[PDB]
Structures are given as C-alpha cells and as structure tokens.
Design a protein around this ligand. Sequence first.
Ligand SMILES: CCCCC[C@@H](O)[C@H](CCO)SC[C@H](NC(=O)CC[C@H](N)C(=O)O)C(=O)NCC(=O)O
Ligand SMILES: CCCCC[C@@H](O)[C@H](CCO)SC[C@H](NC(=O)CC[C@H](N)C(=O)O)C(=O)NCC(=O)O
Lengths: 219, 221
Amino acid sequence: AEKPKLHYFNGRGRMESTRWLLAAAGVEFEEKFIKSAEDLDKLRNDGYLMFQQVPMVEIDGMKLVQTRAILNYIASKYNLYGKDIKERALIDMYIEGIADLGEMIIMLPFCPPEEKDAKLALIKEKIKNRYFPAFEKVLKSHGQDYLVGNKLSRADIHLVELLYYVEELDSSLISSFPLLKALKTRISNLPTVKKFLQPGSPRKPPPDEIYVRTVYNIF
Amino acid sequence: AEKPKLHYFNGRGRMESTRWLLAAAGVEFEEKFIKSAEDLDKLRNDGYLMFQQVPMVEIDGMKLVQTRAILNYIASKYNLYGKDIKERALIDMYIEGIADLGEMIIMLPFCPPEEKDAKLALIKEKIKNRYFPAFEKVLKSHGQDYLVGNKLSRADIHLVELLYYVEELDSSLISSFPLLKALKTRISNLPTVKKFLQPGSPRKPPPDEIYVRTVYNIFRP
Ligand SMILES: CCCCC[C@@H](O)[C@H](CCO)SC[C@H](NC(=O)CC[C@H](N)C(=O)O)C(=O)NCC(=O)O
Ligand SMILES: CCCCC[C@@H](O)[C@H](CCO)SC[C@H](NC(=O)CC[C@H](N)C(=O)O)C(=O)NCC(=O)O
C-alpha cells in the first residue's frame, strides 16, 4: 500500500500523538499540511472528513478521522495495544487519563490571555496531585520498565510524549517522580523514538504566536 | 463471577452509555449510587478510582475507570466491537463523533444560564448539520440494517441512544433522516434493547435539578 498520509495544521495539537506513535512504531509517513481555511474546506467539500474536522489520516485505503480511532487502529496494527482484553483495559484506562491531561495542554493556547495562568496552575496542580502520582503508583507497584504487560505499549509512548510537554511547561514537576524520569530516559533511548527526537524529524514544536492565529484564521 | 457493578450518580451522565451497552449485551448489573461527598471519598480512599473520578465499573475482578476504557472492555467482551481491525476503525470513528456530541449533552446541565442558550443552539445545529447527515450518509452508503459490518455493533446502540436523546430534545430533528428513524425502530425492537427501553428498567431519566444539585453538592459541598 501507500505511506500513511496525515492531514493537519503544521503543528502539534491533535495530530501530534499520532506522529509519535507512528514514529515510535518505525513507520514512515507523509504529511499534507492544512495551511488555510481553503485547504480545510476543500477536504470538507471533497468528502474526506466524516464530521468536517481534522485530524484525518489516509491509511490502508481508509480516510480515518477522530484521534482515538486513528490511534486505536495504529496501536492495534503495530501491536502496541497489548496482547489481551485485560491489557487493553489497563491501557485504555491509562491513556484516557493521559488524554484528559493532554487535552488541557492542547486547549491552553486558545483560552483568553487573562485566564491562561489560572489554567496553567490548575494543570500543574493536576499533574502533581493526580496524574503523576497515579502513573508513578503504577510503575512503583509492579517495578517493571513498561506500564503494562512488561513490554512496550502505546501507553508508554503516550505517557512520555506528555512528560516532554510537561518538561516544557515546568521542569520541576517530574522531580519527585523517579520512575517517571526513568521511563522517559529508557523510552527516549529506543532507536525509533531516539530518531524521532532528533532535529529534522516530523515532530512539532510547542504552539507559538504564528501557529495560534493560523489556527484561528480558520475558525 | 458476579454482576458488573456501576458506581455513579443516580442519573445518566457518563454512565448512561454503559447502561445501554450492557443492557444491549443482555448483561444484568447492579448499581451502587453515590449520594454524597462521603460516598465519593470512600471510593477514593479505598484506592478504587485511579484518577479520583467516576464512572467506575467493577467487572471481572477489575475496577475500570474512564468511560471509554469501560465501554471498550464491555464492547470487546460481548462481541459488540466488530470482527476485525478495519471494522473497529469505522466503529471508533463513528462512536467518537457520537462521543463529541454526547460530551456537550453531558455538560449542558452544569452551564451557567447565560451560556445555556448558545450551548443548546450549538447542539441542535450540529445534530442537524454535522452528525445526523454523517450517519444518514453511512446508512445510505450500504443500505444495511447496521452501521458496520452488517451485524449489531456498539455503534448502533450508542447512535440509537443518541437518537432517543435528540427526540427528547426536539422531535423534529430526526424528521428529515428516514434511515436514522428506521434504525432507531429496528434496534429498539431487538430483545435486549426492547427490554431496557421498557418502563422500570435501569435506563435513567433526563437530568433534572435534583440531579444537578446532587452533583454540585458531592463535588462542592
Ligand atoms: C478553540 C479554537 C479552535 C480549536 C480547534 C481544536 O479542536 C484543534 C486545534 C488545535 O490543533 S483541532 C481542529 C478541530 N478538530 C477537532 O476538534 C477534532 C476533535 C475530535 N474528537 C478528535 O479528537 O478527532 C476541527 O477540525 N474543527 C472544525 C470544526 O469543529 O468544525
Ligand atoms: C462540579 C460539576 C461536576 C461536573 C462533573 C462532570 O464531569 C460529570 C457530571 C455528569 O454527570 S462526571 C464526574 C467527573 N468524572 C469525570 O469527569 C470523568 C471524565 C473521564 N474522562 C471519563 O470519561 O470517565 C468527576 O469524577 N469529577 C471529579 C474530578 O475530576 O475531580
């Protein structure tokens, strides 16, 4: 077949987790960047977008929208979705906690300027008091190098992706969390991810002033 | 061994689609309702809520939190998740569209009133202009009884659950969507679903104000 093709803005938002997972699985993909309202509306009007939204990924002859469906397909295709129904329960429960947190980080650059610090202090507090404790607790309990099933899954992938973003927000958050740190290093050391973490990869930077109003100059 | 046990408020919210899906799967379940902040703190303190949130469903020895984790497990356990990876992808695409709308419906009672008008307009707009046309098209695309793979999946149950909510909201929205009506009727007349739709089932009423103040009082005493 073809390379998976990613339709999105040139930036992180809702496509980034997929860029990570495909690169983490060692899958070359191509990107067709949505640069204007007109790129979006051509996709909408050509019938590529079931709910009129992106992300969309053309992969194995399907036009897949919705981040979770995109990810679930990719996870399952490349065996990063565990080996049984109980591992997937654990994995889903984990990655849904991550996606809740991660959702707040995606929306942060869109709330009104005057609300930004409030939300950031809220996020930070949720990191320190809810999400990091929960994930440390998981690694602490079983002692293993991976979150689930003692081998690599999408949950380690999505978790570390998020540890990077949290490092960007404030780097003292992971400090009381030894095992989160350790996980970040080990997974960052995997050939596929190491590669994706180097300069020139399809990995995207934080949202900046350009990307933010670009995104508005559509909605 | 035992029946699944649902730990939620006494009402729809984030637990309702699990009630439909287990019902649709023909699975009897018990419900333990959270009435007070104390009930919530007992669950948290027992270490039973991984993110300190509910829904929580005790099922097959596990304590599952996160709606989608719960639903995927049930879905997969009772063969309501399609037969292969590509079917799963259509099911997920379809139900995440439903989830997006459902999220707006779930939050709508905890708006300030100044926001409630617009929010309610937005919900109708999207039902009319995005979601119903999207699923109608799918049904037209293949002419079959079911959304995916021509057998009952979780996608028909979540979508029909939605059609019941849109009817309560405004019964004229579905009028221009004959294929959506047809599905609603056929799914409602499957034994497990028929049973759940009858009066006196665990199916829950629309949120009212006793529900809204119950939830406020539990999280903000
Ligand atoms: C608040 C200002 C704009 C914010 C837009 C953000 O949602 C994101 C921008 C950052 O990348 S992404 C663009 C959006 N997509 C979705 O919301 C998909 C959600 C689905 N649940 C998913 O996970 O796939 C979009 O295409 N919107 C057209 C529209 O709604 O008509
Ligand atoms: C003050 C107003 C409260 C509104 C709460 C609403 O979100 C919902 C009400 C619908 O009945 S439900 C209670 C909420 N649960 C989740 O948000 C789970 C989300 C997860 N992504 C899921 O899908 O499972 C909750 O437990 N909140 C405590 C907290 O997070 O600390």
